[PDB]
Design a protein around this motif. Sequence first.
Motif, PDB file in Angstrom:
ATOM      1  N   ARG A   1       0.807  -1.234   0.000  1.00  0.00           N
ATOM      2  CA  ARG A   1       0.000   0.000   0.000  1.00  0.00           C
ATOM      3  C   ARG A   1       0.833   1.274   0.000  1.00  0.00           C
ATOM      4  NH1 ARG A   1      -4.522   1.519  -0.824  1.00  0.00           N
ATOM      5  NH2 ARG A   1      -5.458   2.031   1.171  1.00  0.00           N
TER       6      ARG A   1
ATOM      7  N   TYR B   1      -6.238   3.616   7.610  1.00  0.00           N
ATOM      8  CA  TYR B   1      -6.416   3.900   6.176  1.00  0.00           C
ATOM      9  C   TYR B   1      -5.642   2.911   5.254  1.00  0.00           C
ATOM     10  CZ  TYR B   1      -6.669   6.081   1.610  1.00  0.00           C
ATOM     11  OH  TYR B   1      -6.846   6.310   0.250  1.00  0.00           O
ATOM     12  N   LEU B   2      -4.404   2.570   5.587  1.00  0.00           N
ATOM     13  CA  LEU B   2      -3.654   1.655   4.731  1.00  0.00           C
ATOM     14  C   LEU B   2      -4.308   0.274   4.747  1.00  0.00           C
ATOM     15  CD1 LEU B   2       0.074   2.659   5.569  1.00  0.00           C
ATOM     16  CD2 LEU B   2      -1.338   3.443   3.679  1.00  0.00           C
ATOM     17  N   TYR B   3      -4.914  -0.100   5.868  1.00  0.00           N
ATOM     18  CA  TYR B   3      -5.464  -1.439   5.999  1.00  0.00           C
ATOM     19  C   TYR B   3      -6.851  -1.547   5.421  1.00  0.00           C
ATOM     20  CZ  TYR B   3      -1.868  -3.281   9.283  1.00  0.00           C
ATOM     21  OH  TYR B   3      -0.705  -3.753   9.894  1.00  0.00           O
TER      22      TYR B   3
ATOM     23  N   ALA C   1      -8.784   1.420   3.728  1.00  0.00           N
ATOM     24  CA  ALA C   1      -9.147   2.539   2.819  1.00  0.00           C
ATOM     25  C   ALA C   1     -10.318   3.382   3.334  1.00  0.00           C
ATOM     26  CB  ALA C   1      -9.457   2.018   1.439  1.00  0.00           C
TER      27      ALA C   1
ATOM     28  N   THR D   1     -12.454   6.246   4.550  1.00  0.00           N
ATOM     29  CA  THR D   1     -12.249   7.669   4.274  1.00  0.00           C
ATOM     30  C   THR D   1     -12.799   8.570   5.387  1.00  0.00           C
ATOM     31  OG1 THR D   1     -14.269   7.609   2.960  1.00  0.00           O
ATOM     32  CG2 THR D   1     -12.173   7.505   1.767  1.00  0.00           C
TER      33      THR D   1
ATOM     34  N   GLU E   1      -3.853  10.159  -2.089  1.00  0.00           N
ATOM     35  CA  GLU E   1      -5.276  10.082  -1.918  1.00  0.00           C
ATOM     36  C   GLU E   1      -5.670  10.558  -0.529  1.00  0.00           C
ATOM     37  OE1 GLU E   1      -7.064   9.775  -4.390  1.00  0.00           O
ATOM     38  OE2 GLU E   1      -8.981   9.785  -3.320  1.00  0.00           O
TER      39      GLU E   1
ATOM     40  N   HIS F   1      -5.587  14.388  -0.230  1.00  0.00           N
ATOM     41  CA  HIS F   1      -6.829  14.950  -0.762  1.00  0.00           C
ATOM     42  C   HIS F   1      -7.955  14.843   0.242  1.00  0.00           C
ATOM     43  CE1 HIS F   1      -4.881  14.008  -4.833  1.00  0.00           C
ATOM     44  NE2 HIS F   1      -4.825  15.315  -4.642  1.00  0.00           N
ATOM     45  N   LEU F   2      -8.099  13.688   0.880  1.00  0.00           N
ATOM     46  CA  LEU F   2      -9.116  13.552   1.916  1.00  0.00           C
ATOM     47  C   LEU F   2      -8.971  14.608   3.002  1.00  0.00           C
ATOM     48  CD1 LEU F   2      -9.209   9.688   2.382  1.00  0.00           C
ATOM     49  CD2 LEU F   2     -11.076  11.132   1.505  1.00  0.00           C
TER      50      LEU F   2
END
Lengths: 127, 127, 127, 127, 127, 127
Positions: B52, B93-95, B97, B99, B120, B123-124
Amino acid sequence: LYFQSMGRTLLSLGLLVADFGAMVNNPHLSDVQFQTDSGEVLYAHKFVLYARCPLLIQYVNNEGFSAIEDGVETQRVLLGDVSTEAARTFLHYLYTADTGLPPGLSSELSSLAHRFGVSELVHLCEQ
Amino acid sequence: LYFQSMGRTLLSLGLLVADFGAMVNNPHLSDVQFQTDSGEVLYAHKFVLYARCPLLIQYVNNEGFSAIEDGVETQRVLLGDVSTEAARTFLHYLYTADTGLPPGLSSELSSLAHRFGVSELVHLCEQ
Amino acid sequence: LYFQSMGRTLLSLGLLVADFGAMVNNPHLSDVQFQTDSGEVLYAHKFVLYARCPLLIQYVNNEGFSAIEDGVETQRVLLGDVSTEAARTFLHYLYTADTGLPPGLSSELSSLAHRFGVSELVHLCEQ
Amino acid sequence: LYFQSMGRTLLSLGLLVADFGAMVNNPHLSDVQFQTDSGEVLYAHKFVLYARCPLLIQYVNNEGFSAIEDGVETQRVLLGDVSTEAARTFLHYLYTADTGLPPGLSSELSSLAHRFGVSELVHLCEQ
Amino acid sequence: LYFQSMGRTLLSLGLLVADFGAMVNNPHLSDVQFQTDSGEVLYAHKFVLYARCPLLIQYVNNEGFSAIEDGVETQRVLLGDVSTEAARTFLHYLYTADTGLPPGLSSELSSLAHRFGVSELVHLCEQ
Amino acid sequence: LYFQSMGRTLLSLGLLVADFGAMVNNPHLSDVQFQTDSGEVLYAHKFVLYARCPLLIQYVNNEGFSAIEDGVETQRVLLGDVSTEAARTFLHYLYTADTGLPPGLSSELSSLAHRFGVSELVHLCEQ
């Protein structure tokens, strides 16, 4: 748990539409049928017609008549000036809300939709 | 069978994210851990980091060091200048996704995201 | 901001599944591998198996054995009576939750899914 | 025209579920009813039960009996050991596939779902 | 009423994008036009350019010049080194957000997207 | 790559609606404005009105008149018998297709929608 939740939701709805789709033109528990000008008879179910289409069940009740088929009484209704394929598709929409209408039938369907007040199906046919 | 099909799809994906979410900060099969300035240690898994986040696994391999914890060897990595909650959220998040980032953490997360190239997530955080 | 928000959500999830998909049969960080009856070896990662499939990691731990491949130790597990393509697809599902299963494989997959308790995959195969 | 097309699709399906929802416990065209231990009677429609739930219509046909209510004959079926609210919710699911089940009822629903083979509803209740 | 509500939402948005799509290269109410190296002129509307692309409207205002076409004054802007098809597609994206970009054009589009800061379109082109 | 693809699609569309939303009642590039009975003036853009609402741009062209505001000429149009909030919301719908209409305004909106042939907005208001 949005994905699990929406997944379960779509799956349940998909089963429901498949289940009711299997009742289209199904003589089991049929208490109403439509005769088209070709002589072909389409089995239906007042449950669906009442729930989904007030103008159609009104026509059934007013213009339909008692008939005996294979020793069993039903309400037969003449449905003239329409192909059997178009009539069958119209019933399929009432039973399943399927929007994938065969383009070859749109004129007929729109005429049916118009006659029985199925606004949403008129729109499908115009588009 | 769009609804059955999309339903199955979303449901499967939902299970997957819940399954990997249960591995966040989970010492089982952990082969890497992060120590934050508070002294708190966060368990992680090189599998996820490699798959990731190339800049993070590179940092792990270059700056990490062997450590023994409860008689078991791992790769410990110092992760300074960040709260444990922000570090934990970044791993989440890496595990998974996911948001749904806690707004209180966006500045830290964005700093982490920036440092390790997780576009990504930048941006979030800006949004 | 529903569309921006759902858009970001689907995009993040799409990246996640592509990232983990790249680890299917990937020898990097592989700590377990499956040997099929053809002799072909499939690389896997205990992280995924533990997180996603309790019966499979149990089988790995109970029936697997130490093996040296190219001078590196791993846990090898014999996975008999199944094509390599079916085994690979099963792993792909554990890694990615991809529901697009090749119809030619459904019988094998369903057998795998059954043996290791992957209920959701049984359903995909029956449908 | 994806957005117009999916929009029309969801809208049609939404109308369908609202239309059939209005038939839940609706005595109009009801040819079957359930009596709960409280004495409360729930109106239903064999159309739905046959289409959606083979074990339930089988129970209706085997264990149901003729009854006259307000001078009109129906098939009455005793449905014991369940609250009326749970029975009503179960019927609502058969009619509408609505997955929003009141958490207070999950135990009862799951018992109903189990007894009549509604796998999908069992899953909703466990989750 | 999720399905009715999301259905209405997607349908409305679909109409909006079709309505604005009909304005792409439409001389009606056009107050700006682009001349490509082929000599072809593309009609546009400052409304869209200002709302959607600050760098492009800045270029229009700085580098554009008064021109008379069929007796009517407009702002003409030279847009060199790009095919008319690529320019037209870029405008289509500003007007409609359509992500279905012809793969043959991605290099040009990405160059346009880059020059005028349309980050999202850069990403579409890389992917 | 369904999730990446739909994600990009929804995200692009979300940006588009936010971008055009910022033009609602925005005097920049405004070539038409509506005066309500309160005396309040609402800035609009013929681009949107022409593209989205033939009856409204026809009314603008037929009933509108030249006006000078702060030394700049525009087309002013009297829009009577409606609150400014309702007028503003109607424009917001033409610019953004936003279906989240404040329930307090539905009667007015429906009257506007009716007068200018915005069928879809009539439906939103009835529902």
